[PDB]
Write an enzyme that holds these catalytic residues in place. Structure first.
Site, short mmCIF file in Angstrom:
data_model
loop_
_atom_site.label_atom_id
_atom_site.label_comp_id
_atom_site.label_asym_id
_atom_site.label_seq_id
_atom_site.Cartn_x
_atom_site.Cartn_y
_atom_site.Cartn_z
CG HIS A 100 -0.02 -5.72 1.03
ND1 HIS A 100 0.34 -4.66 1.91
CD2 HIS A 100 -0.77 -6.77 0.94
CE1 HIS A 100 -0.41 -5.54 2.59
NE2 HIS A 100 -1.13 -6.00 2.34
CE1 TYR A 126 -7.34 -12.94 4.97
CE2 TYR A 126 -5.37 -11.98 4.11
CZ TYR A 126 -5.89 -11.76 4.01
OH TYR A 126 -6.92 -10.32 3.43
CB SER A 169 -2.05 -8.82 4.44
OG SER A 169 -3.34 -7.97 3.66
CE1 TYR A 170 -9.11 -9.53 9.78
CE2 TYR A 170 -9.39 -7.99 7.87
CZ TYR A 170 -9.84 -8.34 9.57
OH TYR A 170 -10.77 -8.30 10.14
CG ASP A 208 1.91 -1.69 0.53
OD1 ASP A 208 0.41 -1.61 0.57
OD2 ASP A 208 1.72 -2.61 2.06
O1 LIG Z 1 -5.49 -5.97 0.15
C1 LIG Z 1 -6.93 -6.13 0.89
C2 LIG Z 1 -7.97 -6.50 0.11
C3 LIG Z 1 -8.38 -7.95 0.10
C4 LIG Z 1 -8.94 -7.85 -1.27
N1 LIG Z 1 -9.14 -9.80 -1.92
C5 LIG Z 1 -8.73 -10.65 -1.01
C6 LIG Z 1 -9.45 -11.62 -1.14
C7 LIG Z 1 -9.96 -11.68 -2.83
C8 LIG Z 1 -9.92 -13.20 -2.98
C9 LIG Z 1 -9.00 -13.82 -3.01
C10 LIG Z 1 -9.36 -15.30 -3.51
C11 LIG Z 1 -7.46 -16.50 -3.47
F1 LIG Z 1 -6.77 -16.26 -2.64
F2 LIG Z 1 -8.95 -17.86 -3.52
F3 LIG Z 1 -6.85 -16.31 -4.90
N2 LIG Z 1 -10.33 -15.35 -4.27
N3 LIG Z 1 -11.17 -14.31 -4.04
C12 LIG Z 1 -11.77 -14.05 -3.85
C13 LIG Z 1 -12.58 -12.15 -5.33
C14 LIG Z 1 -13.80 -12.71 -5.38
C15 LIG Z 1 -14.92 -13.75 -4.98
C16 LIG Z 1 -13.99 -15.16 -4.37
C17 LIG Z 1 -13.11 -15.03 -4.09
C18 LIG Z 1 -8.89 -11.06 -3.83
C19 LIG Z 1 -9.75 -9.52 -3.35
C20 LIG Z 1 -8.65 -7.05 -1.95
N4 LIG Z 1 -8.07 -6.17 -1.03
N5 LIG Z 1 -6.75 -6.01 2.17
C21 LIG Z 1 -8.10 -6.64 3.41
C22 LIG Z 1 -7.24 -5.70 4.37
S1 LIG Z 1 -5.92 -5.96 4.45
C23 LIG Z 1 -5.34 -6.02 3.46
#
Ligand SMILES: O=C([C@@H]1C[C@H](N2CCC(c3cc(C(F)(F)F)nn3-c3ccccc3)CC2)CN1)N1CCSC1
Ligand SMILES: O=C([C@@H]1C[C@H](N2CCC(c3cc(C(F)(F)F)nn3-c3ccccc3)CC2)CN1)N1CCSC1
Ligand SMILES: *[C@@H]1O[C@H](CO)[C@@H](O[C@@H]2O[C@H](CO)[C@@H](O)[C@H](O)[C@H]2NC(C)=O)[C@H](O)[C@H]1NC(C)=O
Ligand SMILES: *[C@@H]1O[C@H](CO)[C@@H](O[C@@H]2O[C@H](CO)[C@@H](O)[C@H](O)[C@H]2NC(C)=O)[C@H](O)[C@H]1NC(C)=O
Ligand SMILES: *[C@@H]1O[C@H](CO)[C@@H](O[C@@H]2O[C@H](CO)[C@@H](O)[C@H](O)[C@H]2NC(C)=O)[C@H](O)[C@H]1NC(C)=O
Ligand SMILES: *[C@@H]1O[C@H](CO)[C@@H](O[C@@H]2O[C@H](CO)[C@@H](O)[C@H](O)[C@H]2NC(C)=O)[C@H](O)[C@H]1NC(C)=O
Ligand SMILES: *[C@@H]1O[C@H](CO)[C@@H](O[C@@H]2O[C@H](CO)[C@@H](O)[C@H](O)[C@H]2NC(C)=O)[C@H](O)[C@H]1NC(C)=O
Ligand SMILES: *[C@@H]1O[C@H](CO)[C@@H](O)[C@H](O)[C@H]1NC(C)=O
Ligand SMILES: *[C@@H]1O[C@H](CO)[C@@H](O)[C@H](O)[C@H]1NC(C)=O
Ligand SMILES: *[C@@H]1O[C@H](CO)[C@@H](O)[C@H](O)[C@H]1NC(C)=O
Ligand SMILES: *[C@@H]1O[C@H](CO)[C@@H](O)[C@H](O)[C@H]1NC(C)=O
Ligand SMILES: *[C@@H]1O[C@H](CO)[C@@H](O)[C@H](O)[C@H]1NC(C)=O
Ligand SMILES: *[C@@H]1O[C@H](CO)[C@@H](O)[C@H](O)[C@H]1NC(C)=O
Lengths: 729, 729
Positions: free
Chosen positions: B703, B510, B593-594, B671
């Site tokens: 997605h 990831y 994704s990433y 998506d």
């Molecule tokens: O979809 C996305 C992004 C990712 C982003 N996302 C990143 C992870 C985030 C996240 C995931 C998780 C978990 F996996 F543990 F549950 N915890 N958190 C989190 C959120 C706020 C503070 C601390 C942690 C929740 C938000 C939301 N949109 N992409 C980014 C690069 S490719 C696609």
């Protein structure tokens, strides 16, 4: 044998190029030919030439010019550039006009940029062009243009150009303008697409474009609201810069106006007589109006007594539409290919004032086209010779005695040449023959008075000598019998073919209605490489629904697409699999477009004959495809018409049966013709039943998948797939 | 060994099922739990239960109930049906209210169909809901709603719900409303997307849909126009006394109003005190306002003496956003996780009107979250235990003495349980511990008065039995040392792992910012099958940019996405070779994704290390991804900011290097998050340079590619691909 084979790279890089001889007749005596980017004029009788335009005269022009068009009087040349493709025939370009007398470009009153269509009058040097969906006329290249129409509106009102469906399915052209023989009148159609729904799809463009754009195209799917049409004639000799031009409307006959209908043919008969054919949305009834200019009125009158009805009880009218009439000099009678009582297409002779036509040809074979007409002879192409539906020859018939029919091409070189097309000079004093198989193409010039073979224009000598150093495949053309009917097939056979060895076999399918995939044409293509390098037999079969063999065969699939034509492919392959030289463990099938549909239907049939197959841009469900084409064969997808069969003939309904085959599904995302939608629904049906398969989308490619790189990529990918399918473990 | 392996069908068909214990606290003493479709209420102290709602009470309801929720006072239940998914968190639904006292449905003044969000007030039985983008409040479930906003406008103005980007990237929720603690006030945000560009894509739907629909979503890509936001508070106690209660605006501080900014946190402190955190579009500066209700003006004032600034010199603020404050009862002080001077995230204690906070935890490890606050204790989860950043434990810190820190979970079962989350009762009198690895999940109930274990709720005994009879893989969690820094990795190892054999390795990637793919969690997934059945080692590595290890590591990729996190995965593969149990001819890489982006970047790097890879729904170019996420790490794609690096870190620019590898590219067509566009551009770039590869689109999948059939199809497709990549021919 130490010679190289015909490889994938040879096909892809065009290592072996067929030589052409594309001429354009300018009179009864002379033609133009582009040699070394110089435009030469040739005298047909002697073979001598002059340079009409040196390749260097536009060296300082600034833009690369796409194409040239010399006015019929030879005084002007239209320079086409900034070419931008739209659909199959439509495009926009910029134009400039060069005066050939003055030897200078015209810089006043230029044709605008983004011009949609331009044409010289047939005589002299008037121009008509369409820009922003409106018609304009220039009496002289340097003079201000008269605006003919004011209603042009992007995606809504089309004057002098076709909308999407009329371009693709009716006229096979963007143009919807028809000059009268001497340029006095300009006829044109107007299309109205107001209520026609839009197909919408993404276009991604260059990497730099941040948001994909959405392309929106008025496109009627089967059963949807169709464009409406009107027809007009304007006198271009009585235009004023002070008053707006007056266009006279010729309305369709009452029998058309009662319901949805199409304008499907426009053909001038004389300076003052025009014919139009109209077709009902239910494409088994069409009528010809013959309309005369009234000098007193200024109007156009189409007498009912001059109306001609063409209908079919077994299918639709014409091969893909009602055929073209060919009028005599005085326009009092005409010749037209129509289905006879035995269901074979032959030439009928009509008087404009009489209901009954007289058939001048007959027999169990078909006239392909009428090519030229003089007062003594009608020249036509047919597949009469040797009863081979896949061969084509030029004939002439004596108009005063129909028993006197002479074949003009049959015996010129029967071993090399069994498939001809022809090009006649202005009054049929000369003709060019283009032989295209079974040997290498051969272009010859002839004179009509005693059918002398004057000279060879191009014999592809160079290519012959090069191909001698290559292990080229052969082509077998033959037939099989099904219920006492001959159906033809061809096999592209590997070099050194050995009837005692077993070869894998690839069934190359199209099988659309009126299609012909078994013929005597010479081709260098993917099949050539498959046979020559991979030792695969590439077969094609013309079953029920195929053309040029009469309506009994052609109309067999009427109202019933995805039935007999699919069944007959399976049956042909079944029969091929029992031949000694075919490995029945290794039979594949592929097709593009309609053939992608048939391939998909075959693979979902449950037949067990095919190990694998490839569908490129297939139709998957008839309601997804366009109205004009679909309804021609299927009628309307309503419960009171033919809905049950629209619903029974989907690929999707057969998804489960794919579990026992290897399937590659391929489609361009910017396909405006067979929408990506069609493959999207296939993949989803397969996913839903748990069937694994192979897929490839082509970003921004259309139905042709023909950009240089995508074309190389698709054939590369399909070759890996076939080779893997045929590899013995 | 004669036991069955863990197969693909076991994974795809959920043969071995993890038991959960999902409870919902309804008070300080009681929780709800679903046993055999009944809803039981449990006494926490004794473990006894009654049936709260019989599994038969809604047989004659006439709809499938998707979810329920009980008012805090226990008087009503909200029943959710007609559930229709929107984005990651958003959906629409129908709602009925059931009166638990009268034991009948309410049929009067019903919550409308197509409601976007609904929430009970924190106390009593008030309701707030959003319908057609406007907010409505019912004081009583059976009485008429009070409309709060009139500005709601589809795709333009959102009141009390988030737009696409705020939902996905800012709030991780659809709701944008916040009831004050006793329910007097309703705070809400209003989003304005008027000038935000739309992503557009086709949705094909069921086969019956003749024309595909175009989905249009306001979605700001990097550097594009963002939504603007406003914040309001209404007094719902005034609704029944006044015609139209005023929504009082609380404006952003001057330091935010100078440019683009976000509302990133809303948290009530007391009945009359609200806190708000704002974040500049350049996400290294945030400001917390603390605002008091002014009883004499009906207004909300935020004293600058109470304003707190949070900024970062090395990266962005917070892990993904500024962290939430937890206020003491009186609302005069609060606790907040912030990055300390060494770069580690720890609990800081603030008085609301003093700018310097006091750190109450410290060390080279991180606080993950604050879970509960009582007058005597703060409870939190950290990765302190055994210096294992991939572990998680619950801790208790004494508020009157910070040297008194008790780990409540560390030693409960040290070999089985190294990863905990927790759920506290309403006033933290009880807590449920949820252990999720490295052994089977274990759920236990505990009392806070004495921190004694009350009982095991679920130990996954059934599953442990089944798993005895299966050749399960093992997991190694460890570290390697690069440049004097520890970097963690995990390996899913086949049964009977022998260090003297060479194994194929799949790198599961990831690697986004603050990611963690090396942890102590027990998972039954695709990797389980690959290790168990196919004898593949499945590895993951947390390199630069990964989280929970301090800002030196996390902020290493600041402004430089697609560099160090890509390089470190390659370097990790090299180090796994050194270890001597890896077949260096069979190293693969994959991610979603990433991870798809990183996989793609690694495969196009020219490293020679990897034979093949799979990218699912990858990012391909940062300018295609959304603003809030992308800009957080990359700043702005302008020449003055970071455009050069945006342009330098695309997948497409590495197209030529994919000649060296086998590549499979997969994307769902619908998506909404990582647009199909992103993969459409990868494929086109690859076609353009003549690279063969494998592709799969998933019609109407988003997605997650999470529909049941598509999920099975994709893992099947990928399994074949990996096996073919690895097969010894
Ligand atoms: O979809 C996305 C992004 C990712 C982003 N996302 C990143 C992870 C985030 C996240 C995931 C998780 C978990 F996996 F543990 F549950 N915890 N958190 C989190 C959120 C706020 C503070 C601390 C942690 C929740 C938000 C939301 N949109 N992409 C980014 C690069 S490719 C696609
Ligand atoms: O694109 C299409 C259809 C096919 C249709 N098309 C069918 C073939 C037709 C056609 C092709 C050829 C040629 F191969 F010889 F050149 N000749 N003709 C033809 C046209 C009119 C009268 C007689 C013959 C020209 C028009 C135009 N749109 N699909 C239909 C089912 S899948 C996609
Ligand atoms: C083209 O044909 C048209 C139509 O016959 C010619 O126009 C007519 O010419 C006749 C004979 O001289 C006149 O009496 C009529 O008044 C004309 N009719 C109309 C409608 O204009 C025209 O002269 C021919 N053009 C050329 C260049 O030969
Ligand atoms: C193109 O077609 C549309 C009909 O589809 C015409 O619009 C109608 O025109 C009539 C008469 O002006 C109006 O009363 C209707 O309200 C219109 N109908 C619809 C559905 O819009 C339109 O005039 C035509 N355009 C041209 C130039 O002929
Ligand atoms: C054109 O095709 C239509 C459709 O097949 C024909 O209409 C059918 O004719 C008979 C009634 O006389 C019945 O078989 C059906 O009820 C009709 N079908 C529909 C859908 O209307 C029509 O006869 C054809 N025209 C000609 C001249 O043959
Ligand atoms: C409640 O008050 C609000 C705020 O004044 C009213 O909304 C305004 O209505 C006017 C006239 O329709 C608009 O021009 C304003 O832009 C609106 N302002 C806002 C902030 O929405 C609303 O109409 C009132 N409701 C009732 C029932 O009177
Ligand atoms: C919830 O909190 C609100 C806000 O503090 C309370 O409303 C206040 O109550 C006091 C009486 O103790 C009054 O002096 C104020 O006028 C009220 N303020 C407002 C803004 O209305 C409310 O009473 C509390 N509700 C409950 C149910 O306890
Ligand atoms: C060909 O030659 C004849 C003279 O024999 C001449 O009149 C004619 O113009 C020539 N044609 C061309 C096109 O050069
Ligand atoms: C076409 O476009 C060019 C470039 O914008 C312009 O200079 C030229 O005048 C245009 N031609 C006409 C006929 O308007
Ligand atoms: C011609 O018709 C158009 C549109 O109906 C009008 O705008 C224009 O002014 C007309 N010109 C003359 C000279 O009548
Ligand atoms: C559990 O038992 C106690 C009696 O010791 C009783 O007061 C309580 O109501 C019971 N709770 C439930 C949910 O059954
Ligand atoms: C949304 O913003 C636009 C400016 O882009 C403005 O015209 C409109 O009034 C706003 N609508 C609101 C705040 O309701
Ligand atoms: C925020 O980021 C920009 C770009 O990196 C920088 O110029 C500015 O100084 C930063 N602010 C802080 C507090 O570091």
């Amino acid at each position: 044998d130490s010679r190289k084979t015909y490889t994938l790279t040879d096909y892809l890089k065009n290592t072996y190029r067929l030589k052409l001889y594309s001429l354009r007749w300018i009179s009864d005596h002379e033609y133009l030919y582009k040699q070394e980017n110089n435009i030469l004029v040739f005298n047909a009788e002697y073979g001598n030439s002059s340079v009409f335009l040196e390749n260097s005269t536009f060296d300082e022009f600034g833009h690369s010019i796409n194409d040239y068009s010399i006015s019929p009087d030879g005084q002007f040349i239209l320079l086409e550039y900034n070419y931008v493709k739209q659909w199959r025939h439509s495009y926009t370009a910029s134009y400039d006009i060069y005066d050939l007398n003055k030897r200078q470009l015209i810089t006043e009153e230029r044709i605008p940029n983004n011009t949609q269509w331009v044409t010289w009058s047939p005589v002299g040097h008037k121009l008509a062009y369409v820009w922003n969906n409106d018609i304009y006329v220039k009496i002289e290249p340097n003079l201000p243009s008269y605006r003919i129409t004011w209603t042009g509106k992007e995606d809504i009102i089309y004057n002098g150009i076709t909308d999407w469906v009329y371009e693709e399915e009716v006229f096979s052209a963007y143009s919807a303008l028809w000059w009268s023989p001497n340029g006095t009148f300009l006829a044109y159609a107007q299309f109205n697409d107001t209520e026609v729904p839009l197909i919408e799809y993404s276009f991604y463009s260059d990497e730099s474009l941040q948001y994909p754009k959405t392309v929106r195209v008025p496109y009627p799917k089967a059963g949807a609201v169709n464009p409406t049409v009107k027809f007009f004639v304007v006198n271009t000799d009585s235009l004023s810069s002070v008053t707006n031009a007056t266009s006279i409307q010729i309305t369709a006959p009452a029998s058309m106006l009662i319901g949805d209908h199409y304008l499907c043919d426009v053909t001038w008969a004389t300076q003052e007589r025009i014919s139009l054919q109209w077709l009902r949305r239910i494409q088994n009834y069409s009528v010809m109006d013959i309309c005369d200019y009234d000098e007193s009125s200024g109007r156009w009158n189409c007498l009912v007594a001059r109306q001609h009805i063409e209908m079919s009880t077994t299918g639709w009218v014409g091969r893909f539409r009602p055929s073209e009439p060919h009028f005599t000099l005085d326009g009092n009678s005409f010749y037209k290919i129509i289905s006879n009582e035995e269901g074979y297409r032959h030439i009928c002779y009509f008087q404009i004032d009489k209901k009954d036509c007289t058939f001048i040809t007959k027999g169990t074979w078909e006239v392909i086209g009428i090519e030229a007409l003089t007062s003594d002879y009608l020249y036509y192409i047919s597949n009469e010779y040797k009863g081979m539906p896949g061969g084509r020859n030029l004939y002439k018939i004596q108009l005063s005695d129909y028993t006197k029919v002479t074949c003009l091409s049959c015996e010129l070189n029967p071993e090399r040449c069994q498939y001809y097309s022809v090009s006649f000079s202005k009054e049929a004093k000369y003709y060019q023959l283009r032989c295209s198989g079974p040997g290498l193409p051969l272009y010859t010039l002839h004179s009509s008075v005693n059918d002398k073979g004057l000279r060879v224009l191009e014999d592809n000598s160079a290519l012959d000598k090069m191909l001698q150093n290559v292990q080229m495949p052969s082509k077998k053309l033959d037939f099989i019998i099904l219920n006492e009917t001959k159906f033809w097939y061809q096999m592209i056979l590997p070099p050194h073919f050995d009837k005692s060895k077993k070869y894998p076999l690839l069934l190359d399918v199209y099988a659309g209605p009126c299609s012909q995939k078994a013929d005597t044409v010479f081709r260098l293509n993917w099949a050539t490489y498959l046979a020559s390098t991979e030792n695969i037999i590439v077969a094609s079969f013309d079953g029920r629904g195929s053309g040029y063999q009469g309506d009994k065969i052609m109309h067999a699939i009427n109202r019933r697409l995805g039935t007999f034509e699919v069944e007959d492919q399976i049956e042909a392959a079944r029969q091929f699999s029992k031949m000694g030289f075919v490995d029945n463990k290794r039979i594949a099938i592929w097709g593009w477009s309609y053939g992608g549909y048939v391939t998909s239907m075959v693979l979902g049939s449950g037949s067990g004959v095919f190990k694998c197959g490839i569908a490129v841009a297939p139709v998957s469900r008839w309601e997804y495809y366009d109205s004009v084409y679909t309804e021609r064969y299927m009628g309307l997808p309503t419960p009171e018409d033919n809905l049950d069969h629209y619903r029974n003939s989907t690929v999707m309904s057969r998804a489960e049966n794919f579990k026992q085959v290897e399937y590659l599904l391929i489609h361009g995302t910017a396909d405006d013709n067979v929408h990506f939608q069609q493959s999207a629904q296939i993949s989803k049906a397969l996913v839903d039943v748990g069937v694994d398969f192979q897929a490839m989308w082509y970003t921004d490619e259309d139905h042709g998948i023909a950009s240089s790189t995508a074309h190389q990529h698709i054939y590369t990918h399909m070759s890996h797939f076939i080779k893997q399918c045929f590899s013995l473990p």
